[PDB]
Amino acid sequence: QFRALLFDVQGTLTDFRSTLIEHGLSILGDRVDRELWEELVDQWRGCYRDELDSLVKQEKWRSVRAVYRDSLINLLAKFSDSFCATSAEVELLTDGWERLRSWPDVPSGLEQLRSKYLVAALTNADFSAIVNVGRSAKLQWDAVLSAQLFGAYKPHRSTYEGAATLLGIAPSEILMVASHAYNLEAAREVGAGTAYVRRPLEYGPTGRTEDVPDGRFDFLVDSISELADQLGCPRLG
Amino acid sequence: QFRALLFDVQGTLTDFRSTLIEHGLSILGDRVDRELWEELVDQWRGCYRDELDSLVKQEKWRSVRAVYRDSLINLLAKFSDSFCATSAEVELLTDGWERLRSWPDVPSGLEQLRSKYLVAALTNADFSAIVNVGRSAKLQWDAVLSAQLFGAYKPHRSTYEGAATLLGIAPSEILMVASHAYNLEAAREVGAGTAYVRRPLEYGPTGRTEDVPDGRFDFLVDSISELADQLGCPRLG
C-alpha cells in the first residue's frame, strides 16, 4: 500500500523542549533559573509557530534559523531584567534547534521501517538544520526534504505535492507521519495516508495536547515502533 | 578544512556497467548475447553523457530517466536487426540505472567518513533514482542532492553553489569526490576541494579510464576508505 513514510521532525520525532531547556542552561549557567528558561523556550516555540502561520498565509518563506534567531532576540529584550546574552551566545542558543534530541522510540523505529519502506523527513526546518538534527537525534533517512526546497511551509500543498514528485511516488502511496493534527489533515487532502503520533511531552507536562480520536487518521500510535508493528515490519533482534 | 563531502554517484560509487549488463540479460535473456548487449551498455552511457553535455551548454535540464529511456529507444532502433524489446521491457531496462550496485569499498568508506564529515550525494540522476540506488548500493547519506533540485547538471556552478547554501556551507568547505576528472575541475573553480577516486573497471576491464597524476587534485585514492584515512577519520571495528 505504502512505498514511503514522510516524517515531521520537530516534536514528532524530537524532544525539542527538553533539548532547548538543557541547551540554554548549559550555555547560560546560573545567570538564569530553570523555571524561567523553560518559560522562554515555550514562548520561543510559540513565536516560531505564530510567525510561520503568518508566513504561510502570506505564501512567503524565509530561513527558519532567522525565525528562531529573531524571535529569541525579541524574547531576550522582554526577559532583559532577569538575564542577558551576548550576540555570540544568541547564535549558540539558536544552534540548539540543530541539536534536537529524539524520543527513545525513534531510532529503532526508523530502523524497523526500512525493512519494507523508504523513510524521508519533511520538515519546515531549513535543509541545514535537519541534516544537523540527524546527527544529534540519530535519524537515518533515504532522503531529506525541507520547506527550503519548495519555497513554502507545511501545510501548503506545494510541499506535500513536491515531496511526492521528487520521490517518484504517488501521494496515496506515501504515509505522512506527524504529531500535529492540522498539518496531518492537509496531507489527507493531497491524497496521502495519515499517521498521528501521540507526544504528550512535546510541550512539556504542563502542556495541553491535541485530543485526537480513533478513526480520524489511518494510524494512531504512541511510538514509531508500534507504527512499524502495525505496518507489518518485523522487529529487530 | 572541510565540513561536507559531496559525491558523484554513477561510476564514482557504483559499478553501473556490471549492473546494467546483468540487468538487461535477465530481462532479454537469450534474445541477445552478452557481448552484443555489453556494447549497447557502453553506447547507452555515452548517449547519456552526450545528451547531458548538450543540455549543459543549453543551460537546460530534463529528467535523467527520460534521458536513459530515450537513448535506449535510439539504440534499439540501431540494433533492430539483432533483437527487440517491448515498451514495458524498455522501462524495466531503464530501471537498471536505479538498481546500481556499489563498489565493495563504498558502504564502509562512507560510514568511516561520517565520524568527522557530513556526506551527501550530488548526482545528475533524478531524486527518485538516487533514493533507489541508496538501497541497491547500500548508501547512507546525511543528505541527498540531485540536479533536479537546481535545474542544472554538474559541472554547472549553480549545482555546487546550491548544494553549499542548502547545507549551510561555504564552497571552500566542500570536498567534491568524483571518478570523472573533467567535472572535478569545475568544483575547483567554484572553490571546492577535489578528491579523485580511480575506478579502473568503470568502463570494464578492457576499458580506458582517466589516468590522473599526483598533484592535479587535492586527493588521489583507490577507495573511499583510503580517502577517509587521509582525511583523519578513525577506522571501523
Numbering used by the authors:
A (entry chain B), B (entry chain A): 11 to 247
Reproduce, without paraphrasing, sentences from the article in which this PDB structure was first reported.
Although the previously proposed catalytic triad of RhCESH[L] consists of D18, H190, and D193 (22), D193 should not be the catalytic residue in the catalytic triad because D193 does not form direct interaction with H190 in the solved RhCESH[L] structure. To elucidate the mechanism of inactivation caused by D193 mutation, we determined the crystal structure of RhCESH[L]-D193A and RhCESH[L]-D193N. Comparison of these structures with the wild-type RhCESH[L] structure shows that these mutations did not lead to significant changes in the overall structure (with an r.m.sd less than 0.24 Å). However, the mutations of D193 disrupted a salt bridge with K164 and resulted in a significant conformation change of D18 which subsequently formed a new salt bridge with K164. This explains why the mutation of D193 caused the loss of enzyme catalytic activity.
Microbial epoxide hydrolases, cis-epoxysuccinate hydrolases (CESHs), have been utilized for commercial production of enantiomerically pure L(+)- and D(−)-tartaric acids for decades. All these three CESH[L]s exhibit high sequence identity (>60%) with L-2-haloacid dehalogenases, which are members of the haloacid dehalogenase (HAD)-like superfamily. Studies have shown that both RhCESH[L] and KlCESH[L] adopt a two-step catalytic reaction mechanism by 18O-labeling studies.
